[PDB]
Structure formats: C-alpha cells, structure tokens
C-alpha cells in the first residue's frame, strides 16, 4: 500500500529524529526501551483503526498520535 507506505516512512523518520534527540538526555538503553514501548502503542492504535491499552504516562502520546495520524491522513 503506497499511501500506508508513505505514512510509515514519514513516521519512521520522525521517530529517528526523536530517538536522536532523546539520546542527548538519557542513556542508550532507557531510550531504546522507551522507543520500543512507543512503537508498541503506535502498532496497537493503527491496528485498531484498520479500546486500546495505553501505558501510564503515555496518554498524552495517544492523543497526540491520533491528532498526527488524522492530520497526515487528511493530507494524503
């Protein structure tokens, strides 16, 4: 799916920049665990759209990702 593919490509690039910036604040392993939890939440949200469990402290990310996906989808 070229539309889904472009979305996933842009999302992976955003995640790469986020990972780089986090490596300036936290140790490598903490950043890796955080990125893994984030990708898990992204997967669940995308699969449900195609009640989602949300880890504590990530509710902000769930709301922001809904806003981000709706924005990119209306753009695509």
């Amino acid at each position: 799916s070229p539309k889904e593919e472009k979305f996933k490509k842009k999302l992976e690039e955003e995640l790469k920049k986020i990972r780089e910036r986090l490596l300036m604040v936290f140790d490598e392993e903490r950043v890796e665990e955080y990125m893994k939890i984030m990708k898990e939440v992204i997967e669940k949200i995308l699969e449900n759209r195609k009640k989602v469990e949300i880890p504590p402290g990530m509710e902000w990310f769930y709301e922001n990702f809904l806003r981000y996906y709706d924005y990119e989808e209306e753009k695509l």
Binding site: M24, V25, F26, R30, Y34, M58, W60, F61, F65, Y68
Partner: protein, 186 residues
C-alpha cells in the same frame, strides 16, 4: 431590565476605552523562568526553561458575553459579567530556551488560548468588586522544531500550559484589573 442595559452600556464603553489604548494589544508579559520535572513513561525529565519577549495579541476583540447578571439586595444592585474572545483566539508568542540533559536550544513558540474569558463583579449603590481571568479552557502550544510526537514536546507543552494557568493569567489580571477599575469607577 433598564439597569441591565445601563450596565451593558457602561461595560461596552469600558471595553472600548481600554482597547483604544495601547499596552492591551499587543500586551507585554514579563519574562518568566522555571525549573520543572515530569515523568513520561520510563523517562524522568528534569530541566529548566525561560520565556522571553512574551506578547499577547487578540484582546482588541474583547466582547461582553450576554447580559450583565443583575440582582438587587438591600437597595444595592449587584452585577456579575463575563467578557471574552470566544469566536477569535488570543495568541501568545515568545522565545523559549530550555535545558534538558545536553540539549540547550532556543526556539519560537506560538500558544493559542481558546475561550479567553474574564469574570467581573460590580456594585451600584459603580464600584468594581471582583476581576479575574478564568482558567484557560485549552492552550494549544506550537514549539518550533518539535514534533507533537516528541516526548520533549509533551513535557514542554505540559509545563507551559501550567505556566499559562499560573503566571500568565496572573500577569494579565495585573494589567487588566486596574484598567477596568479606572474605566468603570469613573
């Protein structure tokens, strides 16, 4: 009914006089610095920020919301009013410098306030007895160069929203309350 209309007219005149004057739009807000801590999942953010060159625009659109709520007790008319900018938005722009770990950037921020509203109270034997900027219903923060998915955006936006509900609201009250007091009590 007539008292209500007289109070509406006096309020509209106060609003117009305050808006015809400078300092209200754009309104300077004094610089503000703060330390902060948040927990985003497993991440523990501890850092500092500073807001400089803070300007609020949009208060030229202040408008009375509905009739003055008027009630008479013991020969004294009391009235409570709401004044806001609901159709339009009050925007705060400022330079934000933050330090988290080895990150110490400076970026520009636009923060949009939804449903900016002031609550005001009058007594007529006019004396103004109460004036407050109500807590902001929502503050939408745009921080230059940060994705909405970035945890650093999450932390910074949360700290900034708290700062707006505290410091920014107090500063805007400091500016607006004596202006309205002067205009209404004349």
């Amino acid at each position: 009914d007539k008292i209500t209309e007289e109070i509406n007219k006096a309020i509209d005149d106060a609003i117009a006089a305050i808006e015809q004057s400078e300092t209200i739009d754009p309104m300077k807000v004094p610089d503000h610095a703060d330390k902060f801590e948040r927990h985003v999942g497993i991440l523990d953010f501890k850092g500092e920020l500073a807001m400089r060159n803070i300007e609020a625009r949009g208060l030229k659109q202040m408008k009375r919301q509905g009739d003055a709520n008027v009630k008479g007790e013991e020969g004294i008319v009391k009235a409570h009013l709401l004044i806001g900018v609901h159709d339009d938005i009050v925007s705060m722009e400022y330079d934000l410098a933050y330090k988290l770990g080895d990150l110490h950037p400076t970026t520009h921020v636009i923060s949009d306030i939804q449903d900016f509203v002031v609550a005001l109270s009058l007594e007529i034997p006019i004396t103004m007895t109460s004036f407050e900027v109500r807590q902001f219903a929502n503050v939408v923060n745009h921080i230059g160069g940060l994705s909405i998915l970035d945890p650093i955006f999450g932390v910074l936006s949360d700290v900034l929203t708290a700062i707006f509900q505290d410091t920014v609201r107090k500063e805007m009250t400091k500016v607006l309350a004596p202006a309205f007091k002067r205009e209404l009590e004349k």
